[PDB]
Amino acid sequence: SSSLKTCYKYLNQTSRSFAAVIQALDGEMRNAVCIFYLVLRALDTLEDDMTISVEKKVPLLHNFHSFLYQPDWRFMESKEKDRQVLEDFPTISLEFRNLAEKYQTVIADICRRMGIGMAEFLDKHVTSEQEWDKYCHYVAGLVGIGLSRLFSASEFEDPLVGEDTERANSMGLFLQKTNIIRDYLEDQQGGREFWPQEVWSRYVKKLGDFALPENIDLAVQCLNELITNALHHIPDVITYLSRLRNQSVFNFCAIPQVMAIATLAACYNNQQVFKGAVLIAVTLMMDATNMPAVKAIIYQYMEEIYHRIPDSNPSSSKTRQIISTIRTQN
Amino acid sequence: SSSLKTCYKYLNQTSRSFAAVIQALDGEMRNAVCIFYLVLRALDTLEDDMTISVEKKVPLLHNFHSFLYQPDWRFMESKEKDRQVLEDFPTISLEFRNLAEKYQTVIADICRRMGIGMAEFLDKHVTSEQEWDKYCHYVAGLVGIGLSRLFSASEFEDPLVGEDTERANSMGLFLQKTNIIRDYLEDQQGGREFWPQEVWSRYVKKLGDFALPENIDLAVQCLNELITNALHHIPDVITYLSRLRNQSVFNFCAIPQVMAIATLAACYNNQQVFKAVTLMMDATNMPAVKAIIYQYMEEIYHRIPDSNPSSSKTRQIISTIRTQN
Amino acid sequence: LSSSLKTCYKYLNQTSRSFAAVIQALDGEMRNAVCIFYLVLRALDTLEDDMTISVEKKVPLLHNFHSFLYQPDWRFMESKEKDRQVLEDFPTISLEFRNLAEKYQTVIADICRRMGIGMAEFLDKHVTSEQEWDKYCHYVAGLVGIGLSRLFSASEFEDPLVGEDTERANSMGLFLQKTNIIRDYLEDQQGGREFWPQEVWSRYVKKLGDFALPENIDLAVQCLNELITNALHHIPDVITYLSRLRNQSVFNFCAIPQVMAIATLAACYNNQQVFKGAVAVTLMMDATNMPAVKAIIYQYMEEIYHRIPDSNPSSSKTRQIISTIRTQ
Amino acid sequence: DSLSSSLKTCYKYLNQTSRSFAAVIQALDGEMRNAVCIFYLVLRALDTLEDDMTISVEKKVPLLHNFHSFLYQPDWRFMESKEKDRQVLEDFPTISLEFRNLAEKYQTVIADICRRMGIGMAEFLDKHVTSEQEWDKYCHYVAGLVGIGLSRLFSASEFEDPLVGEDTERANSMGLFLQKTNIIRDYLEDQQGGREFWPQEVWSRYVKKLGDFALPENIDLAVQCLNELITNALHHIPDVITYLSRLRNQSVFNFCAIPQVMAIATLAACYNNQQVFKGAVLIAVTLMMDATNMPAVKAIIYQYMEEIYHRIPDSNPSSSKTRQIISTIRTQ
Amino acid sequence: LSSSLKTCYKYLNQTSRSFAAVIQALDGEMRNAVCIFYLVLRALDTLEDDMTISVEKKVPLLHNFHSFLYQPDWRFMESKEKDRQVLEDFPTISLEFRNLAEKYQTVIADICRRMGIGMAEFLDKHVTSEQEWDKYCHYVAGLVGIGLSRLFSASEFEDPLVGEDTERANSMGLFLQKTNIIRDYLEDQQGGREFWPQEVWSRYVKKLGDFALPENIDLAVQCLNELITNALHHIPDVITYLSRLRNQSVFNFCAIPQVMAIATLAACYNNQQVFKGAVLIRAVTLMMDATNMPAVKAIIYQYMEEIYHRIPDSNPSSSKTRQIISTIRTQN
Amino acid sequence: LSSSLKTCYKYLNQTSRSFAAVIQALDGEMRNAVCIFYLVLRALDTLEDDMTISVEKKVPLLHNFHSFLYQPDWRFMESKEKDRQVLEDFPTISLEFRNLAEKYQTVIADICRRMGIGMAEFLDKHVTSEQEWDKYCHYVAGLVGIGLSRLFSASEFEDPLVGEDTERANSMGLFLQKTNIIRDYLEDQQGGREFWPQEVWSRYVKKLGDFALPENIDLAVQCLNELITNALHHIPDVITYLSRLRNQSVFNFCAIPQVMAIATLAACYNNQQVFKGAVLIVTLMMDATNMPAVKAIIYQYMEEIYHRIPDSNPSSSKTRQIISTIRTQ
Ligand SMILES: CC(C)=CCC/C(C)=C/CNCCN[C@H]1[C@@H]2C[C@H]3C[C@@H](C2)C[C@@H]1C3
Ligand SMILES: CC(C)=CCC/C(C)=C/CNCCN[C@H]1[C@@H]2C[C@H]3C[C@@H](C2)C[C@@H]1C3
């Protein structure tokens, strides 16, 4: 099916750190997840295309889950790079309708529940940490639940995976925050903001001030507070990963999470996060293909952070509290 | 038996990218494969030895499979750097006759059919691509089959692995071609020409012309073409590895393949051949092996110049692997 | 989540940097038991390791150390070691130990006793004969292996046969100790104690502290090579032990230490930097599965084998042992 | 079909000599099959030599002592045997051929157990079993060693934990229990055969000739000796259980359990039974289970134990002892 | 080891037909815990059955039985039953009881107390309504089920769920208990003992003893089937319970009784022999035993059809008898 | 929970003498999948067997049977067999079929399509050569073996290799089908049906029905023993197939049927009762619940037949060879 070939071609084109593990999924989960990642990509391609007015965008987002069942629909007024998926959307919609109704259900549902949240923030900004969790819930949190629901529907993972929408939520919230925190600069030099105001407001006047050499010290302090915030999702991330019983599925969830921790440990109290690029011993003897190994890798990156925590740092007291919990817990 | 310790000694003196993983095999596969490797080595030592009259080497290759049953057979005229296995073959043949009879047949059969192939390609060079597969079969194909027939004989692996020889063959062809494709200069200073005639000739006059700088643009276009050919085997390699269920046997098969793909991804569209998530997971499980493969497929897919004549094929094939499922 | 429990894991990450990680990875009930088993042994060794104390008072403490686990107010403030926090704030450690299931309390309590005894036995004397070198390592490692081995079977995560194999659980420990000692020859010398079997170096130099003298580097290396060859004989038992484990978290905890050990002996063999300071397929597989561990081990056996000066008084010995491992 | 036809012959003799073992032996996994098959055949041919009384002692001894050596004598045979299982001796070259085809590590165990077993069998060619210590010594040579051999094999094939073969005393118990149970039931048969196996220091305190129990008038004293010996055997049960509880391979468990289970089943029927001296003896929650798992085996054993306890005559001079051991097995 | 402990297993085998073997086969601590729990329930039951004891003396004994467990010197010498041995030497069983882990004692004592109060309220009354028949079986069997379950969980050889779902555990007991009552109709009827729910057999005859009368065989059978159909409603829970078990020794302990109970029901269904002595306990069941859930379900369903193929239309329960069976079929 | 599904299991127990109890023991989805996969074959079989339906009317039904699974209102009232209840109430069966997961439907439907073409092929021709006897058994039993194997792999309960290897899956079916054909000789004879390969019985008699005549009993046994020897060759694959299984419930479902088959062949070997009616059937200490047991049981029966092999029997040699092969390797 050349139509299916095209999809995977776009997947590797719009997903450099997932296509590999996705195409490694067993049976049904493979095509399902592949498509699920293509629709969300197209949806994200819209919310970001600024060339589109809010009055014209909201509708496109609210009625995105509908374009799926409309064999002809396709957006051409996209100036983004991923526009390719929107223009040739019919191909994606074609495969989508080729999936079992079970998967069509979960996906379409997410695209709908997500198309609402995304549009909801097209006018406002993330203020409180609570509003930050809420945002991460629509753009990524749901993505976590959607998959968890596909793993249970595929019958490769016990029903509990898709039931505990909490962990599925924390899982996606951990990666999204790690991204938001890491991509601060580019997002700023991109004209967008994702950091919680009620947090950076206690350090500087505008969120963009962290892009100024004179506010580098304050930038790090705020950075550490947001990193300490994401560390709380770990307890759940660990618990979720320990419930998986399918290798292919584990490799799909484990790897991303492990790289999130590695990144947080590489960014913690690091000024490079505001200057340029930030690159990531018993951890050399293990790999993220089994639970006992992930934990060991995680616990290590934890001490790596716990060892660089400044006593002066305003959020140091908290940073240790959480790390101390992850150690003892279980 | 000291005679057994001697074999494992040559195994190390002869191997490197295997000796360790072979000794890791479980149960009787350990000895079977160890001996199976030594006999094939000695056979290959007689094939490469140039200080042997063609009208003296042919019989040796055609009858090497029989010397396994002769307690005192041996070769002394050899000058190769691995003549130790030939001079002290009785030691190897002895341990061969101690292996379960079910293994003797497999090893003897391959060694017999492989000796014939090598004798055939002594006065010839690879001409057509169809002939290239034939050569790789007599040197790497049969090897993949022999092992498959050994793993299923020991019951450590499903009987399917030893039956589908069409797949076990690809395992060998994929590794063989990989080596050949890269070892261009190596075999060029030795005097051998493994690259298929109908391929390089479609670019130059003599196969050694690629070594000349003013042909670097024709050499890289021929290189890429061959690499493309080898990439067609990957689909089978995945199918093959997907059937393995024994860990020790998996490490024995997977590791080589993964290492071979890594090579093609480093030689593709690279002139030096004439002069991300892979760091978070190893090849211990199938899902990982696939993931690793897919990544190397993109590394190559993200370096395919539209100017290269193979641009079409290379992509078409890579698209089939990523779509497979 | 008891604060005292957190205090323990905090001392674990302090007194350790290459074990704390895998220990916290242990499944369920083993996590705590083992973590604690490690701390109580830290204090027990901290005493013997402290010199401010006299053999006059040491013997008593060591012999009764195991009993202090049931005395909520016991603690030692008369120690100046980098590991004081475990002896001074011991009540917090023994407290959690008191909450460990009976099964675990029994095992640990036993090791501490048996260990303390023989540990006090070498407070003055040295390690003369090789057969004595195994006796010492048995008290400071062997039992440790038997302890962990008995804790795995107790938790039921490992087959009960794992606990019975006390002999291989011992060899499993002596392989780490011998390696640890052999490697830290310099520090131990620049500290005050001597562990190298007297009967071994005696026929090399009159004083074990001579191997630190440049004009003896030759005799030094030769002696080293002999000891390393002595330690390699434990490999067969090691491989057999790991070949029995069935739990992943347990395997990771037993395999890693063993791999790092061999990775050290292979780096210290015939190496002269041992008396001056510190020190392909491998990069393809992790020590997370038995077959991989084998490949790793065997691969190191070769890096040692192909570098055995045939002019060494142990070359013959070293070769046959690194041969029984291949054919094994 | 295009493989060893001599191995096919070996299994033919296996079914010819061992009617109630071949089935479970052929059920063994991997290398163990041939190893245990060839091992059982060499010991059967070695047993045939000892049993054949038409062979002088000065002639039989040299054969027993060097029997383990003939395993490497491709053309060695024996055509002067008059026993029924003489076939394995006349066509022995075929058996030794396959013996040399086994891993050289399996040959070591078999060859060794075969050697030491010959030494013992020779010792008891010019003497009889007097004391119990002597009785356990004989059974050791003819059974205790087979238990050790088989155990050393299981461990060698890595199918069973290295502890199985290492513990030679528990393996010895496995062999003694079966051998004794066998002798106790084979009394009448060995009496007409001219071979006495019962320990003198036991039946002597009852009669003057071991053949007296055959004479009906002494059936009462017979059942008394019969009960003392069974009580003697029951002391091997504690180890039989300890040994089985260590097995992890299913095929092996079946191979070791089934026999032991029938052994106890036999002693249970023979206990206080007079027919043991008149004719052959013969066979309820056990009907619900099968000897395939450890706990099931125990249940079967414990149930066969209680079927002997409420049978113990208060009179019999073994009362206290019989009940005593059955009270130890019954309380872990 | 302990002289007192061995005495317990000593009594266990003489007070337990075929149940001590399965118990003695249990793993770890469960072995001793169950042995004691079985004896304490034995004595308690021995007192309830002993008719020589006046209701005035029996009532206090039942209510205070659980407390005797902690009284080192309590014993009963007025018992006249045959299993009175546990009552006269109770101090021993009492001694070992205190040796068990505090957690196990709680269960035994609790089930012992609650069971005493129950047996005490039926001392003068007869089972009337079906609801009462359930009320009774709970006191003499249901609680036994709840008890054991809480013992397996405490030992951690099973999951907490087992000891938490008291309904499934109760059904396990009621099924076996009701089955015994349905079968031993005549036996107990020959002892003045009345168990059959009066509210049920009253729609057929005037007094339960009439089913023993030949001319009422037709009525007796219809009533028989009505009760059996009732017991069948417990199968769903029985299956659910057995499926949650993870320990082999524990499975064999629970599975065997249930299976053997279904076999009894299938054999009694529409059988006229139930009123003329004992009944004959009569496919794919032969090729397999009860040691794995799948086999058990197979054997169970097997007996389900047994009863199904024998359901006559003329029977008043015919319609609802197959209703429950058809339900047990679909429920995966 | 499901008035219809509850009816399916009602029919299962009806048409399934001794198979339902084991099928209802399967885990997860396999349970219903196999129950339905069985009922559909029960119907397709009831048609092929119905002799009151002309061939020209039967061929179309067998060829399109696989399509009726998607025709809700389809049924068959003309059936006169005794297992027609599934045909007259087929809509109730096809309903639950369409409810099965898609992965299961694909398999079940595919088998019917494949089996239909075959059954129609032998509607007017009698089995001739042994090579055709296998082909026929392939359509009636072989396909069922490959069918179930695909369901086990689809349900994820069995390794993907179980459903891949169709050669041994076929043997698992042929071994059972041949045992039935061999045993039910007199039952099929007294019904106007012949399954015994003509190329075979023709070397003993002039009419396959002559074996019913007492004066040919000796020649009948010789043919009987030959066919049995022919079926023994399938054992090697049966043991191989069983040794690949891992799920307990599946093992019981596959092992039990095979065991009873061997026991049946052992009771029928060189047994004259086969031509005069029906023949009834360590082995007590161990049951078919594990591979090792099954083997020992199989071997016990093998020796049972082997010990009764007449030296004069024109198949005695072959009878021994196969036994030795199963025995040794
Ligand atoms: C499997 C469990 C429990 C959680 C998944 C955790 C997880 C990958 C969240 C996605 N957060 C990254 C930002 N997501 C974006 C990328 C991926 C999808 C397609 C594109 C690009 C638009 C968004 C959705
Ligand atoms: C498997 C474990 C733990 C012990 C072995 C238990 C076990 C079979 C003892 C044999 N005791 C019966 C008498 N043995 C004889 C028979 C079998 C062999 C060949 C022939 C006939 C001569 C003897 C040796």
Ligand SMILES: CC(C)=CCC/C(C)=C/CNCCN[C@H]1[C@@H]2C[C@H]3C[C@@H](C2)C[C@@H]1C3
């Ligand atoms: C499990 C593996 C590998 C094979 C299954 C072996 C197996 C049941 C073959 C079918 N051969 C018996 C004749 N089958 C018929 C009966 C049962 C089904 C419904 C009715 C009556 C029509 C046919 C199908």
